[PDB]
Amino acid sequence: RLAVMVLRWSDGSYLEDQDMWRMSGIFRDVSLLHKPTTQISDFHVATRFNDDFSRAVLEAEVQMCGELRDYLRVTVSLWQGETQVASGTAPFGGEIIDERGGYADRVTLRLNVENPKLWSAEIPNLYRAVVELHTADGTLIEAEACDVGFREVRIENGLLLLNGKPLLIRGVNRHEHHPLHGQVMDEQTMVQDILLMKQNNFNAVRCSHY
Amino acid sequence: PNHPLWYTLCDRYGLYVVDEANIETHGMVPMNRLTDDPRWLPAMSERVTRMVQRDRNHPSVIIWSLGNESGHGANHDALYRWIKSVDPSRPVQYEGGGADTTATDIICPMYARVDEDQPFPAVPKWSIKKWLSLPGETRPLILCEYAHAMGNSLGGFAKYWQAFRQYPRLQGGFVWDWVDQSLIKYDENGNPWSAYGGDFGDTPNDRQFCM
Numbered sequence A: 001r002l003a004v005m006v007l008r009w010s011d012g013s014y015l016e017d018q019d020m021w022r023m024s025g026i027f028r029d030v031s032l033l034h035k036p037t038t039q040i041s042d043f044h045v046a047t048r049f050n051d052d053f054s055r056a057v058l059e060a061e062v063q064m065c066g067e068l069r070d071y072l073r074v075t076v077s078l079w080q081g082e083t084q085v086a087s088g089t090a091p092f093g094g095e096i097i098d099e100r101g102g103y104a105d106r107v108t109l110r111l112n113v114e115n116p117k118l119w120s121a122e123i124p125n126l127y128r129a130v131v132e133l134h135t136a137d138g139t140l141i142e143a144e145a146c147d148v149g150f151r152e153v154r155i156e157n158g159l160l161l162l163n164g165k166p167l168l169i170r171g172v173n174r175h176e177h178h179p180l181h182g183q184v185m186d187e188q189t190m191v192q193d194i195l196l197m198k199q200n201n202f203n204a205v206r207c208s209h210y
Numbered sequence B: 001p002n003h004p005l006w007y008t009l010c011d012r013y014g015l016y017v018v019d020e021a022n023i024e025t026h027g028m029v030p031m032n033r034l035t036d037d038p039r040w041l042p043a044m045s046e047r048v049t050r051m052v053q054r055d056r057n058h059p060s061v062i063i064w065s066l067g068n069e070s071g072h073g074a075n076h077d078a079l080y081r082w083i084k085s086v087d088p089s090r091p092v093q094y095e096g097g098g099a100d101t102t103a104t105d106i107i108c109p110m111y112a113r114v115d116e117d118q119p120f121p122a123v124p125k126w127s128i129k130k131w132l133s134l135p136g137e138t139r140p141l142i143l144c145e146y147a148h149a150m151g152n153s154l155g156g157f158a159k160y161w162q163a164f165r166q167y168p169r170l171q172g173g174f175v176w177d178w179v180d181q182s183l184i185k186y187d188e189n190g191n192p193w194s195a196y197g198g199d200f201g202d203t204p205n206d207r208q209f210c211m
């Protein structure tokens, strides 16, 4: 048995003065997650590009918790639909970063990607990154994963660029609001909103204000 | 460069002066044909250097100009730098080649409009408000020529002034121009009348465009 005591007002309320209905409760999902003792505790995915975006490097930093052992490995594999386009395998032990050494509980994988299909609102090309924590000899301990969008966002000479091209933001602010369920969101409502937005020539959304 | 007394009078009466080199090559095709030519650098140099040597002590002169309507040639860049080295006390401007070249400290277009772009190839005349904020642009904007006062004219003059007052980096401009270039001729009865191009049997000529 779980018991959860939810306070409507807290010191947190001073930082939550959004122009919206003031409600309270357990209003998003509750889940139970099982992870192994030796586990992926964090991963970051970055994509960097050459000048014309014909070459990319995917860089995945992976952190673990548990006891560190020589046989442990991370394999990051990148997939374009059903095709594995790149893969890399390494033991833990990051590069030296200071006088005390480096992170023995982290590893960074770097994968080369030629002619990456680029992500934008116009063409949302996605790859799948799979992060496998495993023994060298082939025992999968656990896997985590994400969708990867190959895109560069930068401000250069006063312009916001996406893959080297200046954006024109056709945007809207969107609160999480339902007339029957209040601030509880569901997949159907989210999809309905995205459809209507894109059908009405929006390409951007601001998460007002959370 | 004007008659020497002009500068004395502007010193004493109080007017800001743009002192401009006697270099205009408008009729060349393209406009920079002579000004990009190193053979013409000596002649151009003298028209710039000898002006600065003459007029540098006048407080009324606040800006040096490299001339007018001669495109943008490497000779302009060389002479822009000469002035900056010899006289750091005054900005240098020049409009040729699109009003915002490397040979000018001030965005100094001629007849750029307030709100309307005129996107001519190579040498566009942007809306003055738009011009200030083009990616990477930081310079002040003062039109070397604007509000062409030919005959019944100066329509839209207030639009420039509203913009000048609203935009810090829009620091005004110079109207074109002060006085009609008409000349006195006399009829059969010795009565004087105002003449323009073509009235002296001069041909080809551009008629009333001098007024």
Ligand SMILES: O=C1O[C@H](CO)[C@H](O)[C@H](O)[C@H]1O
Pocket (backbone or CB within 6 Å): A018, A019, A208, A209
């Ligand atoms: O300034 C704002 O204008 C909106 C007016 O409805 C709303 O209050 C937004 O949350 C706030 O950022």
Ligand SMILES: [Mg+2]
Pocket (backbone or CB within 6 Å): A017, A018, A019
């Ligand atoms: Mg508010």
Ligand code: NA
Pocket (backbone or CB within 6 Å): B163, B164, B165, B166, B167, B168, B169, B170, B171, B172
């Ligand atoms: Na101003």
Ligand code: NA
Pocket (backbone or CB within 6 Å): B209, B210, B211
């Ligand atoms: Na004229």
